[PDB]
Design an enzyme around this catalytic site. Structure first.
Site, PDB file in Angstrom:
ATOM      1  N   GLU A  63       0.460  -1.447   0.404  1.00  0.00           N
ATOM      2  CA  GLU A  63       0.278   0.196   0.695  1.00  0.00           C
ATOM      3  C   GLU A  63       1.165   1.333   0.351  1.00  0.00           C
ATOM      4  OE1 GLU A  63      -2.955   0.442  -0.708  1.00  0.00           O
ATOM      5  OE2 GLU A  63      -3.971   2.611   0.141  1.00  0.00           O
ATOM      6  N   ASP A  91      -2.103  -5.676   0.974  1.00  0.00           N
ATOM      7  CA  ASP A  91      -1.186  -4.141   1.868  1.00  0.00           C
ATOM      8  C   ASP A  91       0.029  -4.039   2.425  1.00  0.00           C
ATOM      9  OD1 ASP A  91      -4.074  -2.349   1.936  1.00  0.00           O
ATOM     10  OD2 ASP A  91      -4.657  -3.441   3.271  1.00  0.00           O
ATOM     11  N   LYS A 117     -14.583  -8.637   3.974  1.00  0.00           N
ATOM     12  CA  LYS A 117     -13.579  -8.484   3.435  1.00  0.00           C
ATOM     13  C   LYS A 117     -12.923  -9.749   3.160  1.00  0.00           C
TER      14      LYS A 117
HETATM   15  C1  LIG Z   1      11.697   9.460   9.433  1.00  0.00           C
HETATM   16  C2  LIG Z   1      10.177   8.606   9.869  1.00  0.00           C
HETATM   17  C3  LIG Z   1      10.032   8.441   8.526  1.00  0.00           C
HETATM   18  C4  LIG Z   1       9.233   6.746   8.760  1.00  0.00           C
HETATM   19  C5  LIG Z   1       8.505   6.955   6.491  1.00  0.00           C
HETATM   20  C6  LIG Z   1       7.814   5.316   6.556  1.00  0.00           C
HETATM   21  C7  LIG Z   1       6.883   5.247   5.093  1.00  0.00           C
HETATM   22  C8  LIG Z   1       7.772   4.771   4.465  1.00  0.00           C
HETATM   23  C9  LIG Z   1       7.329   5.672   2.761  1.00  0.00           C
HETATM   24  C10 LIG Z   1       7.817   5.561   1.776  1.00  0.00           C
HETATM   25  C11 LIG Z   1       8.507   5.663   1.638  1.00  0.00           C
HETATM   26  C12 LIG Z   1       8.584   7.184   0.964  1.00  0.00           C
HETATM   27  N1  LIG Z   1       9.125   7.289  -0.539  1.00  0.00           N
HETATM   28  C13 LIG Z   1       8.351   8.032  -2.053  1.00  0.00           C
HETATM   29  C14 LIG Z   1       7.876   6.842  -3.380  1.00  0.00           C
HETATM   30  C15 LIG Z   1       9.443   6.117  -2.999  1.00  0.00           C
HETATM   31  C16 LIG Z   1       9.686   5.789  -2.033  1.00  0.00           C
HETATM   32  O1  LIG Z   1      10.136   5.003  -1.192  1.00  0.00           O
HETATM   33  N2  LIG Z   1       6.564   3.977   1.871  1.00  0.00           N
HETATM   34  C17 LIG Z   1       5.650   4.235   0.751  1.00  0.00           C
HETATM   35  C18 LIG Z   1       5.316   2.920  -0.195  1.00  0.00           C
HETATM   36  C19 LIG Z   1       5.988   2.052   0.314  1.00  0.00           C
HETATM   37  C20 LIG Z   1       7.368   3.042   1.513  1.00  0.00           C
HETATM   38  O2  LIG Z   1       8.099   2.820   2.262  1.00  0.00           O
HETATM   39  N3  LIG Z   1       9.321   4.884   4.455  1.00  0.00           N
HETATM   40  C21 LIG Z   1       9.590   5.614   4.290  1.00  0.00           C
HETATM   41  C22 LIG Z   1      11.739   4.725   4.670  1.00  0.00           C
HETATM   42  C23 LIG Z   1      10.817   3.751   4.650  1.00  0.00           C
HETATM   43  C24 LIG Z   1       9.738   3.296   4.307  1.00  0.00           C
HETATM   44  O3  LIG Z   1       9.270   2.623   4.697  1.00  0.00           O
HETATM   45  N4  LIG Z   1       6.853   4.822   8.343  1.00  0.00           N
HETATM   46  C25 LIG Z   1       7.601   3.747   9.066  1.00  0.00           C
HETATM   47  C26 LIG Z   1       6.469   3.528  10.035  1.00  0.00           C
HETATM   48  C27 LIG Z   1       5.679   4.629  10.169  1.00  0.00           C
HETATM   49  C28 LIG Z   1       6.412   5.343   9.012  1.00  0.00           C
HETATM   50  O4  LIG Z   1       5.523   6.467   8.899  1.00  0.00           O
HETATM   51  N5  LIG Z   1      10.430   6.329   9.128  1.00  0.00           N
HETATM   52  C29 LIG Z   1      11.333   5.549   8.204  1.00  0.00           C
HETATM   53  C30 LIG Z   1      11.587   3.705   9.381  1.00  0.00           C
HETATM   54  C31 LIG Z   1      10.902   4.314  10.658  1.00  0.00           C
HETATM   55  C32 LIG Z   1       9.908   5.324  10.207  1.00  0.00           C
HETATM   56  O5  LIG Z   1       9.339   5.232  10.845  1.00  0.00           O
HETATM   57  N6  LIG Z   1       9.475   9.420  10.454  1.00  0.00           N
HETATM   58  C33 LIG Z   1      10.248  11.224  11.082  1.00  0.00           C
HETATM   59  C34 LIG Z   1       9.467  11.094  12.512  1.00  0.00           C
HETATM   60  C35 LIG Z   1       8.126  10.115  12.112  1.00  0.00           C
HETATM   61  C36 LIG Z   1       7.947   9.549  11.398  1.00  0.00           C
HETATM   62  O6  LIG Z   1       7.865   7.927  11.015  1.00  0.00           O
HETATM   63  N1  LIG Z   2     -11.119   4.628  -4.380  1.00  0.00           N
HETATM   64  C1  LIG Z   2      -9.216   3.845  -3.945  1.00  0.00           C
HETATM   65  N2  LIG Z   2      -8.771   4.540  -3.258  1.00  0.00           N
HETATM   66  C2  LIG Z   2      -7.738   4.289  -2.978  1.00  0.00           C
HETATM   67  N3  LIG Z   2      -6.006   2.835  -3.407  1.00  0.00           N
HETATM   68  C3  LIG Z   2      -7.632   1.878  -3.534  1.00  0.00           C
HETATM   69  C4  LIG Z   2      -8.534   2.529  -4.381  1.00  0.00           C
HETATM   70  N4  LIG Z   2      -9.711   1.149  -4.841  1.00  0.00           N
HETATM   71  C5  LIG Z   2      -8.423   0.999  -5.186  1.00  0.00           C
HETATM   72  N5  LIG Z   2      -7.677   0.710  -4.368  1.00  0.00           N
HETATM   73  C6  LIG Z   2      -6.254   0.352  -4.341  1.00  0.00           C
HETATM   74  C7  LIG Z   2      -6.888  -1.050  -4.070  1.00  0.00           C
HETATM   75  N6  LIG Z   2      -8.045  -1.583  -2.551  1.00  0.00           N
HETATM   76  C8  LIG Z   2      -7.505  -1.232  -1.138  1.00  0.00           C
HETATM   77  O1  LIG Z   2      -6.097  -1.124  -1.163  1.00  0.00           O
HETATM   78  C9  LIG Z   2      -7.875  -1.454  -0.414  1.00  0.00           C
HETATM   79  N7  LIG Z   2      -9.572  -1.365  -0.112  1.00  0.00           N
HETATM   80  C10 LIG Z   2     -10.635  -1.524   0.512  1.00  0.00           C
HETATM   81  C11 LIG Z   2     -11.868  -0.918   0.241  1.00  0.00           C
HETATM   82  C12 LIG Z   2     -12.291  -2.304   0.123  1.00  0.00           C
HETATM   83  C13 LIG Z   2     -12.811  -2.900  -1.873  1.00  0.00           C
HETATM   84  C14 LIG Z   2     -11.950  -1.106  -2.560  1.00  0.00           C
HETATM   85  N8  LIG Z   2     -11.657  -0.275  -0.956  1.00  0.00           N
HETATM   86  C15 LIG Z   2     -11.597   1.399  -0.624  1.00  0.00           C
HETATM   87  O2  LIG Z   2     -11.506   2.035  -1.573  1.00  0.00           O
HETATM   88  O3  LIG Z   2     -11.761   1.846   0.892  1.00  0.00           O
HETATM   89  C16 LIG Z   2     -10.908   1.564   1.459  1.00  0.00           C
HETATM   90  C17 LIG Z   2      -9.074   2.086   0.942  1.00  0.00           C
HETATM   91  C18 LIG Z   2      -8.901   2.820   2.239  1.00  0.00           C
HETATM   92  C19 LIG Z   2      -7.715   3.342   2.783  1.00  0.00           C
HETATM   93  C20 LIG Z   2      -6.815   3.085   0.953  1.00  0.00           C
HETATM   94  C21 LIG Z   2      -7.221   2.506  -0.248  1.00  0.00           C
HETATM   95  C22 LIG Z   2      -8.799   1.646   0.028  1.00  0.00           C
HETATM   96  N9  LIG Z   2      -9.784  -1.544   1.755  1.00  0.00           N
HETATM   97  C23 LIG Z   2      -8.787  -1.403   2.386  1.00  0.00           C
HETATM   98  O4  LIG Z   2      -8.262  -1.505   3.637  1.00  0.00           O
HETATM   99  C24 LIG Z   2      -7.710  -0.895   1.166  1.00  0.00           C
HETATM  100  O5  LIG Z   2      -6.314  -1.428   1.538  1.00  0.00           O
HETATM  101 MN   LIG Z   3      -6.274  -2.664   3.612  1.00  0.00          MN
HETATM  102 MN   LIG Z   4      -4.529  -1.337   0.334  1.00  0.00          MN
END
Ligand SMILES: C[C@H](C[C@@H](C[C@H](C[C@@H](C[C@@H](CCN1CCCC1=O)N1CCCC1=O)N1CCCC1=O)N1CCCC1=O)N1CCCC1=O)N1CCCC1=O
Ligand SMILES: Nc1ncnc2c1ncn2CCNC(=O)c1nc([C@@H]2CCCN2C(=O)OCc2ccccc2)[nH]c(=O)c1O
Ligand SMILES: [Mn+2]
Ligand SMILES: [Mn+2]
Length: 178
Positions: A63, A91, A117
């Site tokens: 996610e 997710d 779900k």
């Molecule tokens: C420093 C710390 C920040 C959090 C951030 C982390 C969320 C997650 C964010 C992004 C990656 C960013 N993008 C952008 C596109 C390409 C890309 O890669 N996405 C989205 C898709 C999956 C993913 O990875 N990231 C970033 C680093 C690793 C990670 O998992 N997390 C995880 C816990 C809750 C949270 O927020 N981190 C980093 C590790 C520990 C932590 O907590 N801070 C600052 C103070 C508050 C806080 O939490």
């Molecule tokens: N309108 C769209 N906005 C963004 N992401 C979307 C989206 N339609 C599809 N996705 C990506 C795939 N779905 C999910 O990943 C997901 N879906 C669901 C339910 C059940 C059926 C649709 N749904 C939903 O859309 O609202 C929930 C929601 C909440 C936060 C983030 C995303 C989705 N509950 C999940 O907990 C979940 O993780």
């Molecule tokens: Mn979900």
């Molecule tokens: Mn999802």
């Protein structure tokens, strides 16, 4: 809207940005559909706290990425491990337990939202884990994946978010919107 101002001042900006990107990617505007804006931010933060739970590099976060990159990582996990390709985007993936995870954050009974779900997935292999805004949780095979302390933080955070909405008189309309 007031809900939008609260969401933006309640969640950290990275989380708000991923929700905005994900909503406009599906044609929805956070400034109008403010309740779904709140729900995506909550669901996002829960997934990230979840992924933070457990050991190091344990969960491959699905996610928060855009659709085609998210399916790219899923296809790689499937061809890597050999698990079945789910019909709906999950997710997380648990490298320790070898299963995808669907994370849900609901405003109803954990039994009802679990039932919705579990029947929609119909993949059997995908693990399901439901949280509520009152501290309740339900998980497949009663297997809650993470330790109690990590799950308790998520529940605590959810209830903190609920009180903040209610103080702004937004909690009622938010539950009457899911
Ligand atoms: C420093 C710390 C920040 C959090 C951030 C982390 C969320 C997650 C964010 C992004 C990656 C960013 N993008 C952008 C596109 C390409 C890309 O890669 N996405 C989205 C898709 C999956 C993913 O990875 N990231 C970033 C680093 C690793 C990670 O998992 N997390 C995880 C816990 C809750 C949270 O927020 N981190 C980093 C590790 C520990 C932590 O907590 N801070 C600052 C103070 C508050 C806080 O939490
Ligand atoms: N309108 C769209 N906005 C963004 N992401 C979307 C989206 N339609 C599809 N996705 C990506 C795939 N779905 C999910 O990943 C997901 N879906 C669901 C339910 C059940 C059926 C649709 N749904 C939903 O859309 O609202 C929930 C929601 C909440 C936060 C983030 C995303 C989705 N509950 C999940 O907990 C979940 O993780
Ligand atoms: Mn979900
Ligand atoms: Mn999802």
């Amino acid at each position: 809207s007031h809900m939008e101002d609260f969401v933006r001042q309640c969640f950290n900006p990275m989380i708000v940005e991923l929700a905005e990107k994900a909503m406009k990617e599906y044609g929805e505007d956070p400034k109008i559909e403010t309740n779904k804006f709140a729900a995506i931010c909550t669901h996002l933060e829960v997934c990230f706290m979840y992924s933070d739970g457990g050991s190091k590099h344990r969960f491959e976060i699905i996610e928060g990425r855009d659709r085609i990159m998210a399916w790219t990582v899923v296809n790689s996990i499937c061809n890597t491990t050999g698990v079945e390709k789910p019909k709906f985007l999950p997710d997380l993936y648990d490298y320790k337990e070898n299963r995808f995870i669907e994370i849900g954050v609901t405003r109803r009974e954990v039994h009802i939202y679990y039932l919705e779900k579990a029947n929609k997935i119909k993949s059997e292999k995908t693990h399901i884990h439901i949280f509520s805004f009152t501290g309740e949780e339900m998980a497949t095979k009663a297997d809650y994946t993470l330790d109690e302390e990590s799950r308790a933080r998520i529940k605590t955070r959810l209830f903190t978010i609920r009180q903040e909405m209610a103080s702004r008189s937004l909690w009622d309309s938010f539950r009457q919107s899911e």
